[PDB]
């Protein structure tokens, strides 16, 4: 009677209960290679196994493996039956259909679910916000996208996706530190430097500014000690990192950057509905997370826009998880409930059930 | 004169002349308001008029939609479309050498006389070629002669065919004709003739019809998804699983074990046989018409980086190496390789320099892919490994502050 929630994303898992203000359970999208071995404890072996992402650019690309993450959610993480509890998955935006097809039928037919429902991850954190009209910036560890909605409908022809997210920044980090003169080059030591780029990394307002700066000042560095108790520095690596979002060319990427794909993705909108959306720019997800990221998009929205244009970026300190607890709100609303794919809807019409009620 | 025309009026200027005035009145009569208006301002700008209209296909879709020269664009396109010829027609028109990929002067215009030397180099460099034509332009139903006007030494004969549409109009004292280019040009013929004490070539052309959707990327799609529904129900289990492997992201794989020669360095069964599937899935439905597609091209493909000084196209001196090494060449991609029907800039490729556009002639493998639900937002058309494109000639545009190239190619296997 409780429902589930569980956010599946290319690096993490957020799940949860319906109702609850967080998710339960924060776990790494990793499998180890019937049998298995997943998230932490898929860190059984970095040796006779690797590490296997499922979850590639926000879409499930090996249902063997994502099956093991599911069955670690229920009754490793969440420790609760799949048959007694109503469960909401969520999916990138421009999920194929067959994928959501098979997610269903996965559900169903594995886990046996008493009832299922599939949301559009940024759908459900423009929803968290109380919104149902704005184009969400949803930026994770594998993907990023633009997505306009309007009066709570996704508008599919105006999407934009970059696969530019969080794992290339921390990559592109190892990068410049390593040209710094330290080295960082192993799996771990890309943990580490993701923990650096978490803490430390901040988005620059203007960035020749910020360049010129730091090359004839010392008060950008910052200090980070490793785990062995060696203290390294940071200068300018902190703003340049983060910099890729805005500029693709940094690690080889000849892509627009999130301010050009969010301008690209309004304009592609109705010309009666772009005001709206410029008057509510939501972000989502971990790599919006960089201090200095709302201002930076203020200023290069604004340079793009009509002069005359108010913008405003909403940025919420509980962004991060912004997409699952919209799937909370969402699971627990009375109006709802009349969505959820029953177990007898699937048996009556199979899973191309989720194409007519998700 | 006859009662009828002749599909070629030679040297008779005074009757191709008269002929055409007749031809500028009746037309008159089938011109709307906004049509006439479209006729008045390009003779007022032709230059301008004419250059918007060779390279506006290549900028974002929505940039394309707000430029106010499209109100131009498609009324003086519509006026040229609607009076469509019943039987072919020659026509004749001045071009720099430079068009055809002859980036030299064939003589100087002080010179009277062309050296074999330059009619052997010409011939070899506009010899087996389709050669890409674009936007509005001015031609004649005669032969320039004694005391024309002829500002080059390269005269293009050029053989119109049947429903080609043709705009006859005045222009205060003189009978003109304007089209429309939407088609490729081969060069049948070259001749060295004299015209008023001066020696010109004179090139015997005529043409190849291709679909060219540009930037009607919803009309592409309608004709791609008309012929390709089809296909995705005509492959086998395992074609149908390895082309969906290749799709969702397998290609990097594939494509790399390729490129590295993979099948003969280090041979994998398994990648073997996908990429024989995938091939005999690409020869099922052969592409059905004659088709021009794009390719936004990393620079890797012609060994340039990102940071490379050399891709620097804002300098001519870059542009020029570049033609140096790739213009008339041929270039084999082992890798199978992704074009699309449409010419517009998008978010995933805004920033690239290289453009390819490829003429692929009508039974070429080739599938659109966009026709199997998942990944229609590419209008995307797959083609075959081991690909070899013939590039004719190299143009560049600006996009912006940043200069960007054209690569006109054809697929000849
Ligand atoms: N590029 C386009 O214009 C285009 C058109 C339609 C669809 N797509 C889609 O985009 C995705 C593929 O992106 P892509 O085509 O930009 O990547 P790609 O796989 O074609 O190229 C990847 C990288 O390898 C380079 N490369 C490819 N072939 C090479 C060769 N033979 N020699 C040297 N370097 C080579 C490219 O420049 C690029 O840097 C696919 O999903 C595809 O369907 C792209
Ligand atoms: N405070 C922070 N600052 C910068 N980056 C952060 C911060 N916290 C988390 N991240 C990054 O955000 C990413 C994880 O965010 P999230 O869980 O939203 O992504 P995901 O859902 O796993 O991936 P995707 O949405 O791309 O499929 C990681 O790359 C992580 O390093
Ligand atoms: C606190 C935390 C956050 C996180 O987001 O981890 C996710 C998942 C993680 C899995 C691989 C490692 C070894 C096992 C980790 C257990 C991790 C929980 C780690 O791979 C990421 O680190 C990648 C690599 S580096 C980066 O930028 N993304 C993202
Ligand atoms: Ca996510």
């Given at each position: 009677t409780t429902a589930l929630v569980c956010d599946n994303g290319s690096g993490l898992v957020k799940a949860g209960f319906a109702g609850?203000?967080?998710?339960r359970a924060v776990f790494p999208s990793i499998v180890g290679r019937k049998d298995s071995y997943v998230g932490?404890?898929?860190?059984?072996?970095?040796?006779?196994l690797t590490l296997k992402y499922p979850i590639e650019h926000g879409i499930i690309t090996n249902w063997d493996d994502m099956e093991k993450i599911w069955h670690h959610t229920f009754?490793?993480?969440?420790?609760?039956?799949?048959?007694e509890h109503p469960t909401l998955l969520t999916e990138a935006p421009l999920n194929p259909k067959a994928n959501r097809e098979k997610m269903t039928q996965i559900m169903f037919?594995?886990?046996?679910?008493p009832a299922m429902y599939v949301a559009i991850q940024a759908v459900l954190s423009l929803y968290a916000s109380g919104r149902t009209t704005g184009i969400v910036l949803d930026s994770g560890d594998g993907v990023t996208h633009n997505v306009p909605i309007y009066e709570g409908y996704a508008l599919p022809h105006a999407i934009m996706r970059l696969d530019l997210a969080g794992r290339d920044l921390t990559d592109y980090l190892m990068k410049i530190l390593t040209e710094r003169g330290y080295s960082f080059v192993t799996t771990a030591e890309r943990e580490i430097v993701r923990d650096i780029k978490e803490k430390l990394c901040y988005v620059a307002l203007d960035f020749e500014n910020e360049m010129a700066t730091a090359a004839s000042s010392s008060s950008l560095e910052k200090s980070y000690e490793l785990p062995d108790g060696q203290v390294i520095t940071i200068g300018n690596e902190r703003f340049r990192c983060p910099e890729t979002l805005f500029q693709?060319?940094?690690?080889?990427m000849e892509s627009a950057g999130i301010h050009e794909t969010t301008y690209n993705s309004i304009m592609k909108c109705d010309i009666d509905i772009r005001k709206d959306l410029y008057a509510n720019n939501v972000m989502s997800g971990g790599?919006?997370?960089?201090?200095?990221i709302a201002d930076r998009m203020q200023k290069e929205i604004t340079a793009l826009a009509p002069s005359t244009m108010k913008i405003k970026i909403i940025a919420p300190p509980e962004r991060k998880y912004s997409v699952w607890i919209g799937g909370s709100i969402l699971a627990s609303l009375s109006t709802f409930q009349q969505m959820w794919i029953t177990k007898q809807e699937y048996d009556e019409?199979?899973?191309?059930?989720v194409h007519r009620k998700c | 004169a006859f009662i009828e025309r002749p599909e070629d009026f030679l040297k008779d200027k005074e009757n191709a002349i008269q002929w055409e005035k007749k031809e500028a009145e009746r037309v008159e009569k089938n011109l709307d308001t906004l049509e006439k208006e479209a006729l008045e301002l390009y003779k007022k700008d032709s230059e301008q008029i004419s250059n918007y209209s060779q390279t506006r296909?290549?900028?974002?879709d929505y940039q394309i939609e707000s430029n106010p020269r499209e109100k131009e664009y498609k009324n003086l396109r519509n006026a040229i479309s609607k009076?469509?010829?019943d039987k072919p027609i020659n026509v004749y028109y001045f071009e720099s050498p430079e068009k055809f990929?002859?980036?030299?002067?064939?003589?100087?215009?002080?010179?009277?006389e062309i050296s074999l030397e330059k009619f052997n180099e010409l011939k070899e460099t506009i010899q087996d070629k389709l050669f890409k034509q674009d936007g509005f332009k001015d031609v004649s139903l005669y032969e320039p002669g004694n005391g024309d006007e002829k500002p080059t030494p390269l005269l293009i004969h050029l053989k119109l065919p049947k429903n080609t549409g043709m705009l006859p109009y005045i222009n205060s004292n003189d009978v003109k004709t304007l089209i429309e280019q939407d088609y490729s040009i081969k060069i049948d013929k070259i001749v060295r003739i004299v015209i008023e004490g001066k020696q010109y070539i004179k090139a015997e052309a005529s043409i190849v019809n291709s679909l060219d959707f540009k930037d009607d990327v919803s009309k592409g799609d309608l004709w791609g998804k008309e012929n390709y529904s089809d296909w995705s129900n005509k492959l086998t289990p395992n074609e149908l699983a390895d082309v969906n492997d290749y799709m969702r992201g397998g290609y990097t794989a594939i494509n790399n074990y390729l490129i590295s020669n993979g099948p003969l360095n280090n041979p994998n069964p398994e990648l073997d046989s996908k990429v024989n599937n995938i091939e005999n899935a690409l020869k099922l439905?052969?592409?059905?018409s004659n088709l021009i597609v794009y390719r936004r091209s990393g620079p890797q493909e012609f060994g340039?980086?990102?940071?490379?000084?050399?891709?620097?196209?804002?300098?001519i001196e870059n542009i020029d190496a570049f033609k140096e090494k790739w213009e008339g060449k041929v270039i084999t991609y082992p890798n199978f390789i992704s074009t699309s029907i449409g010419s517009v800039n998008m978010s995933?490729?805004?920033?690239?320099?290289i453009i390819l556009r490829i003429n692929i002639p009508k039974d070429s493998p080739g599938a659109?892919?966009?026709?199997?639900?998942?990944?229609?937002?590419?209008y995307s058309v797959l083609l075959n490994h081991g690909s070899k494109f013939k590039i004719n000639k190299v143009d560049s545009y600006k996009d912006g502050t940043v200069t960007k190239l054209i690569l006109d190619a054809t697929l000849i296997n």
């Amino acid at each position: 009677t409780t429902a589930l929630v569980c956010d599946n994303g290319s690096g993490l898992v957020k799940a949860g209960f319906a109702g609850d203000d967080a998710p339960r359970a924060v776990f790494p999208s990793i499998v180890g290679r019937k049998d298995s071995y997943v998230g932490d404890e898929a860190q059984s072996k970095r040796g006779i196994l690797t590490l296997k992402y499922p979850i590639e650019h926000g879409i499930i690309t090996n249902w063997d493996d994502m099956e093991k993450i599911w069955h670690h959610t229920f009754y490793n993480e969440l420790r609760v039956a799949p048959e007694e509890h109503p469960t909401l998955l969520t999916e990138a935006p421009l999920n194929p259909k067959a994928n959501r097809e098979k997610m269903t039928q996965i559900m169903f037919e594995t886990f046996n679910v008493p009832a299922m429902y599939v949301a559009i991850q940024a759908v459900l954190s423009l929803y968290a916000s109380g919104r149902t009209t704005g184009i969400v910036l949803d930026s994770g560890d594998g993907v990023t996208h633009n997505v306009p909605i309007y009066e709570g409908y996704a508008l599919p022809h105006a999407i934009m996706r970059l696969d530019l997210a969080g794992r290339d920044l921390t990559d592109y980090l190892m990068k410049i530190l390593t040209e710094r003169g330290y080295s960082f080059v192993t799996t771990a030591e890309r943990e580490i430097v993701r923990d650096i780029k978490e803490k430390l990394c901040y988005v620059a307002l203007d960035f020749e500014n910020e360049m010129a700066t730091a090359a004839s000042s010392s008060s950008l560095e910052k200090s980070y000690e490793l785990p062995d108790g060696q203290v390294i520095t940071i200068g300018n690596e902190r703003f340049r990192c983060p910099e890729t979002l805005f500029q693709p060319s940094f690690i080889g990427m000849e892509s627009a950057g999130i301010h050009e794909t969010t301008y690209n993705s309004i304009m592609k909108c109705d010309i009666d509905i772009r005001k709206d959306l410029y008057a509510n720019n939501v972000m989502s997800g971990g790599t919006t997370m960089y201090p200095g990221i709302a201002d930076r998009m203020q200023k290069e929205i604004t340079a793009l826009a009509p002069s005359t244009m108010k913008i405003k970026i909403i940025a919420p300190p509980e962004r991060k998880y912004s997409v699952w607890i919209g799937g909370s709100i969402l699971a627990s609303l009375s109006t709802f409930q009349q969505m959820w794919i029953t177990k007898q809807e699937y048996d009556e019409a199979g899973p191309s059930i989720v194409h007519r009620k998700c | 004169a006859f009662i009828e025309r002749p599909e070629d009026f030679l040297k008779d200027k005074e009757n191709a002349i008269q002929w055409e005035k007749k031809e500028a009145e009746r037309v008159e009569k089938n011109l709307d308001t906004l049509e006439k208006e479209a006729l008045e301002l390009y003779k007022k700008d032709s230059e301008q008029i004419s250059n918007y209209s060779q390279t506006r296909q290549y900028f974002y879709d929505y940039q394309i939609e707000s430029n106010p020269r499209e109100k131009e664009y498609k009324n003086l396109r519509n006026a040229i479309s609607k009076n469509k010829i019943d039987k072919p027609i020659n026509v004749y028109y001045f071009e720099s050498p430079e068009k055809f990929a002859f980036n030299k002067e064939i003589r100087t215009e002080n010179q009277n006389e062309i050296s074999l030397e330059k009619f052997n180099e010409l011939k070899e460099t506009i010899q087996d070629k389709l050669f890409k034509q674009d936007g509005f332009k001015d031609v004649s139903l005669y032969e320039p002669g004694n005391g024309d006007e002829k500002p080059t030494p390269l005269l293009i004969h050029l053989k119109l065919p049947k429903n080609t549409g043709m705009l006859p109009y005045i222009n205060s004292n003189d009978v003109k004709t304007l089209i429309e280019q939407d088609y490729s040009i081969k060069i049948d013929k070259i001749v060295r003739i004299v015209i008023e004490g001066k020696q010109y070539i004179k090139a015997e052309a005529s043409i190849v019809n291709s679909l060219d959707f540009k930037d009607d990327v919803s009309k592409g799609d309608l004709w791609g998804k008309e012929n390709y529904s089809d296909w995705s129900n005509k492959l086998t289990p395992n074609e149908l699983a390895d082309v969906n492997d290749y799709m969702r992201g397998g290609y990097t794989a594939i494509n790399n074990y390729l490129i590295s020669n993979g099948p003969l360095n280090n041979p994998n069964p398994e990648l073997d046989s996908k990429v024989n599937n995938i091939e005999n899935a690409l020869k099922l439905t052969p592409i059905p018409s004659n088709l021009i597609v794009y390719r936004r091209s990393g620079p890797q493909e012609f060994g340039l980086t990102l940071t490379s000084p050399e891709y620097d196209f804002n300098k001519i001196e870059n542009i020029d190496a570049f033609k140096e090494k790739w213009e008339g060449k041929v270039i084999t991609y082992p890798n199978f390789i992704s074009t699309s029907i449409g010419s517009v800039n998008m978010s995933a490729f805004a920033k690239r320099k290289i453009i390819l556009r490829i003429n692929i002639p009508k039974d070429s493998p080739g599938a659109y892919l966009s026709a199997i639900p998942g990944y229609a937002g590419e209008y995307s058309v797959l083609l075959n490994h081991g690909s070899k494109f013939k590039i004719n000639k190299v143009d560049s545009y600006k996009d912006g502050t940043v200069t960007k190239l054209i690569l006109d190619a054809t697929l000849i296997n």
